């Protein structure tokens, strides 16, 4: 990454073994559950395109997803080149391939990122990557919100957990449906409570 | 394209 | 977070992998036991709104709670906007959405937090979050203090542990009841000891 | 509201 | 905590995830064995009252002990207020509640701790806490020293371990008894060795 | 008192 | 490695125990799966030839691969000496053996790497090593892309994972084949979808 | 401990959670095997008497040993007071109790340790502690060197390991005996090899 | 160890708990496999003789090896004294015993190591130690290269692994033999391939 | 003595 | 060659 | 010798 030092200057630092291992382990354990994306974003704080490519490349398996990610990056890079049609010792303008780190060196990336004003190629590339990861989350979301219905004896709290877990995954890239998909006994209670009830009030009502 | 199937992220082209 | 450096200046730092993992693991293991809140507060020391949102987003599951948390934040943000009705290169005033980090950038958050005088948007947002987490603790508290009664052969110490564990959870958002809910043998001893006895003296008395 | 159901914490609006 | 930096100045630092986890884990594993207290003291080195409250609050369960601790802190705080009967931009004098961190802010705590001369509210509060923890150790000590007697075939070394483990817990808040509680065969040997023998000499004598 | 039953360590009063 | 310090100067640092252990563990667990190479590259960031040799030497077993690696390094070193035919207190020019760290001392390596302009012997040697590791990945790739065919009941997603995992390993040192190797039912669907379909669109189509 | 900083000055640092845990774990796993002493010494590098007392106090159990250690410290402290018979704002001379940290504060310890010339009370106390730990190792050494004899089918290497493991423990506070305690077949070979043989030559000779 | 600081000066640092534990664990797990030596060298980067003795002393068991190591150090120290036949406040010349850290203090070691020009006693002693460790590796090498022959159904790759693992251990202190020790079927193929074939080409040829 | 049985290391006397 | 069979990476020659 | 059997590495002599 690029971070501050004692002199207050932005300097490059090696990606740490802790960071490398944390990303490998979250992918292994969580695959492409929605919560993997904010973890990726947090672990790649201040990342250069090189660092982002390092993290993506350290992933073994999940290569269908990684290929979809390549497609998304290709699309975002093409759009950048469309919108940005591009001297000794002077800073050139970054193309899509430079932002994605295929045609740019680490030193060029540092030059752009620490310039005044800065050209944040690390943040731009992360945006494309996060866009692609969100599509993968949506692709691998197993259940439609329409099929999340409360069981006859399922506690309301457990149903609400399933409901909003499903909604999170499905929307990666409500109040009335929650009530409609509730079981007969809680639906009766929720109808009597009426519209305008908070989730807390609904959960309290069907708790007993 | 910037990236091709079966090639690493960051792979230089040509 | 924002922390001090050698120059004595407040500078932004990336949220560390240790911090990220610790929060994920405490939620996984402890769910919403009361002790999870002070851990959240400690792990989010010096946090920007962005850092707080990162921590909240890294949580997989528990989405009923996370939705209740959203409601609470919406309420606190609305109240802020009511109480605080809001130029080139000048610092704007933060709205509720800026404090919650939806409409503010990381650099704007750093600007407010490191200003003189500082506008501590990180601390304000944490206050709203902790408020919401306390409601969730209360919601998920399984037992009323009225149903914590000492068993016929339960050691007094174990009963007192259950009593004050329950009280902590129930009050998230006594001396006489402790005695009344004690079993016959210890109640007799505690009655003879009389009122004004410390917990230590009570536990010593029913220890044998 | 600031936050909506099924949307991440910090999600920009509009 | 408050620690030194490159400039040689006392600056506040966030309590680390390592510190937070270490304290949680020692309580979980060791409960209130005597060795937990010096660990608490070491882990809370340079701690503000806020840090001390953080550590205490992160503890799940053990709420009988935590309530006894509250009582002790209340007693020590009352005594402070008795002995210390308490202007724009000037430093006020800390009351008991300020030392315990209920009525003082983190910045006020830092002000007192880094003042010249310093008012070490962190150390004062830790003293009260350690006082309370010692009482809890004594309360939860299971065995009297009078009931530690060497078994007919128990090796002397194992007996001495039990003897001094028990003594440590019982005294939280000898030479002759060690001999008297020894079994017939070692007692005979220890009598012949006579008084004035070191523990090493006693253990050597009953080793065979 | 400074601390009350069932309230966290550091809990502000009033 | 060689890294920056507070003075902004490039100084040598000891390879850390975390780095050493991470490399040992990734080789133990992953052997020579493609993802081991970017991990090696990341863990050896800023590495001297000495550091690179340290990492390679800490590997127990896998000595067939390590011998192939030696061959590759010998070839790249020979080519360097062909292309670069090589005074008191002056900097000599590095030969192949110096780059590989057999005939150069750590101080000579630091001299070359921190010179102005710098002679990046660490990066040159890493290039040779990564070249050799890629050949080993190719050698140990178990399956040809021609033998990756979708099973009668294998979900399309699982097939695509196998397809691109195999392709990655085989190419270490497509769109039409993916369709041809699909099973009858998905092939029919993919034919109807037609050429020009993205991987995402293909996976969506055969998902049901 | 006391360590150097950027200004090149000796400043106090808190004992770290890593250090605290490492010492607790080595005692738990290894008890009082000889190798525990150099680990103690290494973990207590730059330690104040306070730090040394912290490490000793964090030990649960092993209280027979800890009591023997107290005796040894009492003896060494008495000798110090015999050899060293001891003004506003001036540095007093440390007595035995000050070195052992019973009657000295942390600030007094830092004063003595960082003085010019320095009075290394941390090193003096560690010397007494290491003296006591060595006696405990000797006390808990289970086997005499006289009873380490090579088994009829025991490989010579395994015998030599037992021989020198025993010797290390027994001497805490040879060449001919090694041969005499060897079994008939190796003894014959070692006799033929003759005196003046290195251990390596002896082990090579009895290897087959 | 001795390392650089912000001022660019060589200052002593305490050996870290991570370093201490890593060395203990590698010896426990790997005993004296060849890869343990480069790990020792890497973990002891910048080490003083004191640090090297600390690492060696923390090893429990393996005392036959440690005694052989003592012999080797004695030999190298004797040779140093032969080749180097050795005033108030002035630097004395280090003898063998000083390099091995028996007769030199930590401060004397730091004096020699940080002098201009530096007398690298840490590196000299490490050389002697590594020399001794290599002899131990050779001593504990279980198999001669002559007895590594490919099994009738053993894959060639697995045979080559055994071949070069054995060679590494045996040489601690080829092309034709590899072919001769191959089984009939691969030997035939390797003969047809002819001499001058790389290991990669040989492995490819016998892969099928 | 400096240290007494059953008392912590570093325990102040009197 | 720079490296020989059975010899460590970085092994000095001659 | 510098080191003797059964004595630690770094053990001072005499
Ligand atoms: Cl893969
Ligand atoms: Cl979720
Ligand atoms: Cl609790
Ligand atoms: Cl090997
Ligand atoms: Cl104990
Ligand atoms: Cl041993």
Numbering used by the authors:
A (entry chain A), C (entry chain A), E (entry chain A), G (entry chain A), H (entry chain A), I (entry chain A): 1 to 86, 92 to 178, 186 to 220
B (entry chain B), D (entry chain B), F (entry chain B), J (entry chain B), K (entry chain B), L (entry chain B): 313 to 326
The authors write:
Here we report crystal structures of assembled HIV-1 CA hexamers with peptides comprising the linear binding epitopes of NUP153 and CPSF6 and the two antiviral compounds PF74 and BI-2. To attempt to explain how these diverse phenotypes are achieved, we carried out interaction studies using a CA that can be assembled into stable hexamers through the formation of engineered disulfide bonds at the NTD-NTD intrahexameric interface. The structures reveal that the binding pocket identified for CPSF6 in CA NTD is actually part of a much larger protein-protein interface that also accommodates NUP153 and is present only in assembled CA. The complete binding site is formed by NTD helices 3 and 4 of one CA monomer (referred to as the ‘first site’) and NTD helices 2 and 7 and CTD helices 8 and 9 from an adjacent monomer (referred to as the ‘second site’).
To understand how CPSF6 and NUP153 interact with hexameric CA we determined X-ray crystal structures with the same peptide ligands used in the ITC studies. Crystals of each complex were obtained in two different spacegroups, hexagonal (P6) and orthorhombic (P212121), similar to those reported for the uncomplexed CA hexamer. Within one monomer, CPSF6 interacts with N53, L56, N57, M66, Q67, L69, K70, I73, N74, A77, S102, A105, G106, T107, T108 and Y130. Previously, we have shown that CPSF6 residue F321, which occupies the same pocket as the phenyl rings of PF74 and BI-2, is critical for interaction of CPSF6 with capsid. We confirmed that CPSF6 F321 is critical for hexamer binding, as mutation to alanine abolishes interaction. Within the monomer binding site, NUP153 makes unique contacts with Q63, while CPSF6 makes unique contacts with N74, A77, S102 and T108. The unique interaction of CPSF6 with N74 explains why mutation N74D prevents binding to CPSF6 but allows co-immunoprecipitation with NUP153 and remains sensitive to TRIM-NUP153 restriction. Outside of the phenylalanine binding pocket, the two ligands form distinct interactions with hexameric capsid. Both cofactors make interactions across neighbouring hexamers but while CPSF6 contacts the CTD of the second monomer, NUP153 interacts predominantly with the NTD. The ligands diverge after the shared phenylalanine, with CPSF6 residues 315–319 intercalating between helices 4 and 9 in neighbouring monomers and making contacts with residues Y169, L172, R173, Q179, K182, N183 and T186, including hydrogen bonds with Q179 and K182. However, mutants F316A and P317A both have significantly reduced binding affinity for hexamer as measured by ITC, while the introduction of charged residues by either P317D or G318R abolishes binding completely.
